[PDB]
Symmetry: C3
Subunit: 654 residues, 3 copies
């Protein structure tokens, strides 16, 4: 007790799981007592073979059984799960459920306008996936090909990824916010032979350009042989390059309503998803087929307490890992309907999220902390109008949750009845690492609680590189052994995959996050230790933004850091130095330069112009100074007078 190192633990008492939730369970809970979970967790770490074997056979339908549950080491980067097994993601997500209950809802597609909303049953999802998959096969997509997807968060993207996996190909979903240059690089890296996109998207009542950005990047993408285009708005003046572009509706009507699924090996690539790390250009994270689906199945069934009668709503976009796991695979593997929203929580009214939960009587809701802050400041009153009584579990993902936000979440939406589960994980983790299991774990506000099955959490001292033992401790967060849903490599570049995750601390998986552990065992996440800032959930490497600013001929050097913006969580500020008029206009010109190389979400909130940057004698720009200058101004540098200049221009600009 009386924590000294973990200051956040002090003054925090366990918020017991509300009693109303256990009554709203449609069936007996998967786990009875919290002591039962600790016994399950202890087995997954000590005996991984005896723990995950049965669960894999229970939750996955195998075309061919595996001979070995776990192989490989973190140090050697040769991890593998369920070796010898053969299965298919589209059979487990669609086919098997469509045979039992064809008319059961599968995709509840809620569009930007509710007039364009519709529901697809599992029988319908099987027919549409088979048809789309039939088109890609006639085009020549085979096992081992990568197929790119540039679609908004609607049912069409869900259908696309399943049809690609159905053939044994790997899908690479590119976020619709990205620019043309970001599509160019990502496609060329994967050597995609096909692209699935739409004519244009509609979000918040505005018509976003989609196909036009694809045509721009595709002139520099020679691997793409053919492109599939969906008529989301049916705009007549949308050009389609002959021989390359073909129409979704026209081609799918040519092929039958059932296509045989292609068996893939357990360690065969399921998908690629590009993320930006502290150093280097965005890398292509690869996930295996079997170990990923299992991880998604476990975390969904047990942490969220998902039963066959439940309905899940996950707000995240499929362009990021959250939509991948807990808007598609997780729910569909368990045979429950998932809610896919193509709009924003503000259009038409700020209660749009809550109409959907009322309309479809959703039982589980998954949201990012950046959206809860937006709703509180803007549309807090609308919540009471809608029912929201069907919700049993409220989740949080992507950003640190504040105790202030946690209490607002519990009563304003859950009415002190729902269970709150702060789910900490990563794109590379595939599934949840640390989260409160609903009905089991009493959550401490702000803490992600205990680690999940198969995750052996530990802290490491950053300087000495030793594992810290005990409680009331702080350090770098790392995992001792690999787990089923762990990412297996970076596409065509395993060396950077080792240099990033396995080599910083050999024998450990490097998460890039600082954490603390209290005496109760609950884990507190303190943010990323490398040069990555979480801006509205999007991870952004400072180096990617800095390289975009330097593309302008005038920019001699640039440096970007992050600070706490209330709405966005973190915002990147740009301190740029020019070589040798209209200073305010050039600042805006740099903002679109970042918006052109990367996308609109990378644009800095402000750009401060200084002649000299705070540098050490060797040359390293003192990012610690620029960080504090943004907030509070209170070591050895080259010129200290330059610091007064940076403070002068910061107030002048921001």
């Amino acid at each position: 007790q009386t924590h000294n190192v973990v200051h956040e633990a002090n003054g925090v008492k366990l918020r017991e799981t509300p009693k109303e939730f256990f009554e709203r369970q449609p069936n007996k809970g998967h786990i009875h007592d919290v002591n039962q979970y600790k016994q399950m967790y202890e087995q997954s770490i000590k005996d991984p073979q005896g723990f995950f074997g049965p669960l894999a056979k229970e939750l996955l339908s195998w075309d061919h059984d595996f001979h070995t549950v776990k192989s490989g080491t973190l140090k050697n980067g040769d991890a593998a799960w369920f070796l010898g097994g053969e299965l298919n993601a589209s059979y487990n997500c669609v086919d098997r459920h469509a045979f039992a209950n064809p008319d059961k809802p599968a995709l509840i597609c809620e569009a930007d306008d509710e007039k364009d909303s519709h529901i697809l049953t599992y029988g319908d999802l099987l027919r549409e996936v088979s048809k789309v998959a039939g088109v890609l096969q006639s085009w020549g997509i085979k096992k081992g090909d990568t197929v790119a997807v540039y679609l908004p968060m609607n049912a069409q993207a869900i259908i696309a990824m399943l049809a690609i996996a159905r053939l044994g190909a790997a899908h690479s979903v590119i976020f619709a916010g990205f620019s043309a240059g970001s599509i160019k690089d990502r496609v060329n890296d994967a050597s995609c032979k096909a692209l699935i996109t739409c004519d244009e998207g509609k979000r918040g009542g505005r018509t976003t350009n989609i196909k036009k950005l694809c045509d721009e990047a595709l002139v520099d993408c020679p691997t793409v042989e053919k492109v599939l285009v969906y008529k989301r708005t049916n705009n007549p003046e949308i050009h389609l390059t002959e021989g390359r572009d073909y129409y979704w509706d026209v081609e799918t009507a040519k092929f039958p309503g059932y296509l045989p699924p292609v068996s893939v090996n357990s360690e065969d690539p399921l998908f690629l998803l590009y993320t930006s790390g502290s150093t280097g250009t965005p890398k292509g994270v690869v996930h295996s087929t079997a170990g990923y689906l299992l991880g998604a199945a476990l975390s969904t069934k047990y942490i969220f307490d998902i039963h066959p009668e439940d309905i899940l709503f996950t707000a995240g976009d499929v362009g990021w890992i959250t939509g991948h796991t807990y808007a598609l695979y997780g729910p569909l593997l368990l045979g429950v309907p998932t809610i896919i929203f193509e709009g924003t929580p503000a259009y038409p009214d700020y209660g749009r999220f809550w109409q959907i939960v009322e309309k479809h009587k959703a039982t589980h809701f998954y949201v990012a902390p950046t959206a809860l802050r937006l709703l509180r400041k803007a549309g807090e009153q609308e919540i009471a109008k809608y029912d929201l009584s069907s919700l049993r579990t409220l989740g949080s993902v992507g950003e640190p949750i504040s105790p202030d936000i946690w209490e607002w979440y519990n009563e304003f939406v859950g009415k002190n009845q729902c269970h709150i589960s702060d789910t900490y994980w990563q794109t590379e983790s595939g599934s949840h690492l640390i989260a409160p299991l609903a009905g089991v774990v009493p959550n401490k506000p702000g803490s992600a609680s205990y680690p999940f099955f198969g995750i052996d959490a530990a802290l490491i001292d950053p300087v000495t590189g030793v594992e810290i033992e005990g409680n009331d401790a702080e350090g770098v967060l790392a995992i001792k052994d690999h787990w089923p849903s762990m990412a297996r490599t970076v596409y065509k570049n395993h060396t950077k995959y080792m240099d990033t995750y396995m080599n910083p601390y050999p024998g450990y998986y490097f998460t890039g996050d600082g954490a603390a552990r209290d005496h109760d065992g609950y884990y507190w996440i303190r943010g990323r230790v490398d040069d990555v800032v979480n801006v509205s959930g999007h991870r952004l490497s400072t180096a990617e933004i800095e390289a975009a600013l330097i593309e302008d001929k005038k920019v001699s050097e640039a440096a970007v850091v992050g600070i706490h913006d209330d709405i966005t969580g973190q915002a990147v500020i740009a301190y740029v130095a020019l070589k040798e008029e209209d200073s305010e206009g050039l600042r805006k010109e740099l903002v679109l330069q970042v918006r052109k190389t990367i996308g609109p979400f990378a644009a800095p909130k402000s750009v401060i112009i200084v002649q000299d940057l705070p540098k050490t004698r060797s040359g390293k720009i003192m990012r610690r100074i620029l960080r504090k200058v943004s907030s509070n101004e209170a070591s050895t540098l080259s010129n200290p007078q330059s610091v007064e200049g940076i403070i002068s221009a910061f107030g002048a600009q921001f």
Copy 2:
């Protein structure tokens, strides 16, 4: 009793199964009583899962077992059988039998001249198929490729289709009668990467040109990379385009006598077979692998009463669905020798069919009604010379059988000892739909008796579109649910497949045939309701013939209909109107224009030339008038005087 609507049922008494047949059975009959069959049939309709499951495991050797017997609906066009199963057609047709009895006869190849006849054992068929398959594999044929076959009805074609299926490819047999333009269209549609043909064919003592027609179409077929040519006559002056054409004997000698078969999914395409429907160009009918072979195995074993000691003779050509199912797959699946005839029933003498039955002591004989009429008028006396005592079952296929022909069949050939089984089915049906089961069902002459296992027959009123209930009823014939051997789609054009079979009467499979059902339950087929005429067994769309006539610049409009010709069953007459001398010569010039675009069997018997066609005010040519004018002349038209002109020119011409 006392049928009013079904006039054919009146005056017809059951012709009981002859007692001599049961004694000639080499073993106990598959079905004991007719009540046993009705119980089997009732199960196949009520419980399809419990009926076809065991039969599939019994009659098919699976590389991998299936998880679901039946999926999909007619309304959605997503039918599938034995989902998850893996198997290969060449293993079930050749390999497994060759292991048990290598020296057992498999292909009894009876050529145009008996001096060129030979027998291939199952061990020989395994070696020749493996070698041919070895050539196609080195050429690059893989699972999912289509391979065209343009061969006469000999052992080489049988070997070809097995070698193609062995690799998992799909074979498209093109009838040797077709012209070059028909090969052109069919090949381009399937995008065949290879072609198997012969130098030239010999039929009825005449040397038919084969390779030369292939070279003509192949200049407009870019997908064909290589061609395999068999030396049927070894004509020295047969050109072989270098890089494309290679020799059957030369290449097969390069590869070993065993090649591993490639596993295909149950719903993977087995073959394509092009047929002409009332509307549109000829379409590519697709059949699955597993559901087709089962249907062929069931219909052969039970309707024909085929036992391991039996020998089957089916006269049909492999260019049509009859040779596909009951000259190749059906017999070979059950491990019995099949008789392949490359000649005609007239050369050398009209008793050639009966020498073969005597020579090889055939037990089952399958023939079309168009051949029975030819033999009766020309060579009726030769039958008594040959033994023909080994025959147990006589079959009829393709055309309506007349009660006059049925009685001639029973005594002149069967000697009132064989069982006659009128087998009604379709290219799309894959296997028999309605037929008398030998040893079980007493056949009514002219009636195809009761429907077969898994076929839920029903009649629909054409106008109201309602299912007719009761007996003494007539209407459109339709099947309530799909069946294993049902065709799954039209190649690369599922929309026309729905528009033709599933959309005319939703929830039903449209057969395109009129039928009647008497009080005993026996079904009577009354012919096709759409614009298709059965000329000597070949289904011919009127629109395909009309489009060929219109290719001549002079032809303004044309219209073709059918009437009863004794020899051909039905003959198509052509009424053509020219724009603006040698009228008799231009009539002959049009006949070869049809023979050039389609083939020799489409040529009209006569061509009547009129200036105006009987038309409604909207423009539809009154095909009912041209139909009656051909036979007996006894509504609102545009000009009635034109009718007197059509009658005047009909007598003048025909």
Copy 3:
């Protein structure tokens, strides 16, 4: 007794298996008594299905089980084993052992210099094979592709063949001694899409050129898309053609440490290996996957008495069948470490072979008789310095072993404690045919003893073509039925495969060797009957050397034969006749002409020049005369005076 025909059997007594060996067995011997072996052998011949079935399931890990143990006949050339089975060679050789004992040694790589020696564990071999296999897959290598290997006898070649088989591709190892023209022909025949080689090799302290010879042949090899180059010496001035050549270290670092193995059918090609027969250019011998690995597993486990605790040293190069079977697959299948030597038994000292046996405490040693003669004449004394006490079994392979050499082997190296096993077999045989089983069979010096499991040995009279029955008999050696590891065909040329092995004596496998059988049943090999001479183990067709000499414009005709050279066993002499000065220099010019078309090992020891060759009236060069002229001069020819000229020039030259 008192053998008359088998003169070698007379005066020979059984040398009983030394008692010390049974004590040095780490476990109970696989076979207890010699009578037990005869009962096992009798079953393998009478009931092949009941004998090899269990052994295949015991010694091989199957991805899918087979349905038939044995099919096909020698006469039809359609042999097949374990039909229907699916497996992978790299799983059985690496993966399965790496799971049980990752840190167990697998490849003990002893380089030309011991400073460059290293050991790879089974876990390491799994990671390196997976990475290399990962590179070939991204390059596009798939099941059915051939990949060429031009590497010396080191660990890199072993890794290469496993990675190729891992993908289901077939590897074609080309011996590093061969010239550029020999690589050209071999690659073009197989149509290899990739090549794995190294910058240069080091052997006996000399730097051999390797990559440079590849670049020379690759300009005439269009099928090769990409090439993998290993940095054996890291010579900076090694050119790498851009787009074609890539670096082993650079590419393998890009791919992960585990790659899923690809299932292949039992009869799918494992590898190709080119050998030269009496007639024709070198042919590509093909071996199946399953039947080969089993044969290698049986012969290694039982003839050599290999147990899990044993260590094997086989001196042969992987460029020939010996390194294939008993330096790679045989040991690795059984999960024991194998010793790979990149040097020669003379460098640094003649006791290098024996340091390795002492260093790694090797228990089994495999050597060719040509090396035992070299060591005896040059470095006999070094043997006593090293321990060599861990050896239990000494083997002999490739050449006839002399009784003089057999006794030297037994005491000078084995110290009358090891068991000597003369293993006679062929490239086409895949595994041992006739050999003494250690611990079971008392070996007669010079005799290979009894045939092995599944080999039904018999002798045939060369003239009459009848099988000789009884003992004290001599004739052509042939095998009555095929066996699992028998070669299945010649690549893309099955006709020559039949003409060579199955057609000379139908119903028998032609070995090309003369043999004798004594009253005890022991077999004595008397050499090859066709025009093939074993020069230092390399089989060399006389026709291949003769064609190389004739390439020079001056050479009108040439004829080469073989005689007994002490060091090389057999040496080829060249008698060449020119069309029309510096006679000694042209003789040397011809020697390099052979060294350029074939390789350095084909160069004749001497070249005798004569104007006329001893010829029959039809024209056949009397090779019997040139054979005797070389040794002792003691029929009807065209000119007898030419014989005096050949004798005159032989003494003048050689």
